[PDB]
């Protein structure tokens, strides 16, 4: 008896360093497409339909960015948030360092009791030869899975998830988990 069942409305906010792939993640989830050209700073206003554990959910997707007006509209994004996606890039150890240094303090300040899913995006670059060579000149290497999991443990995240928006792998499961968290 699913027909006519009222949908549940929930709000998701996605944050993280510039160029880690926040907007690309939202477009892959919403449209089942990895865009490569003409991608905006933030994804269009979007409410996604998702069915999880038998519940019909309408999930509002709030994208954020990091300069000028976006520095100001970002803190205004947090009211009434039900789940946070906090993103770093596996090809950027620096973006992972900003998880405890910047993003977790900001989210705890404005969204104290809201579940956080820590997302390591660009997992397709972990074993990319060119990426590994560029990071090697800085004596760095791509983030290891256990390093992402460790950071998720440290910040009390609802979960740790890895994605490639480029291949689309893992993206559905991130938003399914976020929806389960939002329903809590």
Q: How far is the CB of 6 from ligand GDP (least distance, A)?
A: 33
Distance (Å, whole) CA 103 – CA 96: 10
By CB under 6 A, residue 179 contacts ligand GDP:
no
By CB under 6 A, residue 124 contacts ligand GDP:
yes
Half-sphere CA count of 79, side-chain side, radius 13 A: 2
Instruction: Show the tokens assigned to 14.
Output: 């996605």
Identify the burial level of 130 via C-beta atoms within 10 angstroms of its C-beta, where 0-12 means exposed, 13-18 middle and 19 or more buried: exposed
Scanning 54-62, 142-150, 154-162, 163-171 for contacts with ligand GDP by CB under 6 A, the matching segment is: 163-171
Q: How far is the CB of 63 from Mg ion (least distance, A)?
A: 6
Of Mg ion, ligand GDP, none, which one sits near residue 165, judging by CB under 5 to 8 A according to partner kind?
ligand GDP
By CB under 6 A, residue 172 contacts ligand GDP:
no
Q: Which of 5, 9, 18, 33 binds ligand GDP (CB under 6 A)?
A: 18
Which are the contacts of 23, defined by CB distance < 8 A and separation ≥ 6?
A: 39, 40, 41, 42, 43, 63
Radius of gyration of the chain (CA): 16
Of ligand GDP, Mg ion, none, which one sits near residue 24, judging by CB under 5 to 8 A according to partner kind?
ligand GDP
Segment (H or E) for 14? strand 8-16
Nearest to 113 by CA among 38, 182, 44, 20: 182
Nearer to ligand GDP among residue 124 and residue 147 (C-beta): 124
By CB under 6 A, residue 164 contacts ligand GDP:
yes
Q: How far is the CB of 3 from ligand GDP (least distance, A)?
A: 36
Scanning 16-24, 47-55, 96-104, 138-146 for contacts with ligand GDP by CB under 6 A, the matching segment is: 16-24
Distance (Å, whole) CA 62 – CA 16: 13
Q: How far is the CB of 75 from ligand GDP (least distance, A)?
A: 18
């Amino acid at each position: 008896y699913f027909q006519g069942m009222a949908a549940i409305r929930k709000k998701l906010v996605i944050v993280g360093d510039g160029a880690v792939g926040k907007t690309s993640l939202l477009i892959v989830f919403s449209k089942d497409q990895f865009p490569e050209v003409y991608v905006p700073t933030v994804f269009e206003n979007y409410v996604a339909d998702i069915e999880v554990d038998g519940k019909q959910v309408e999930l509002a997707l709030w994208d954020t960015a990091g300069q000028e007006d976006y520095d100001r509209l970002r803190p205004l994004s947090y009211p009434d948030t039900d789940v946070i996606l906090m993103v770093f890039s596996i090809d950027s150890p620096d973006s992972l360092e900003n998880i405890p240094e910047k993003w977790t303090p900001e989210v705890k300040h404005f969204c104290p009791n809201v579940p956080i899913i820590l997302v390591g995006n660009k997992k397709d670059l972990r074993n990319d030869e060119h990426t590994r060579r560029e990071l090697a000149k800085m004596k760095q290497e791509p983030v290891k899975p256990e390093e992402g999991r460790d950071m998720a443990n440290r910040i009390g995240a609802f979960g740790y998830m890895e994605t490639s928006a480029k291949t689309k792998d893992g993206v559905r499961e991130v938003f399914e988990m976020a929806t389960r968290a939002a329903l809590q």
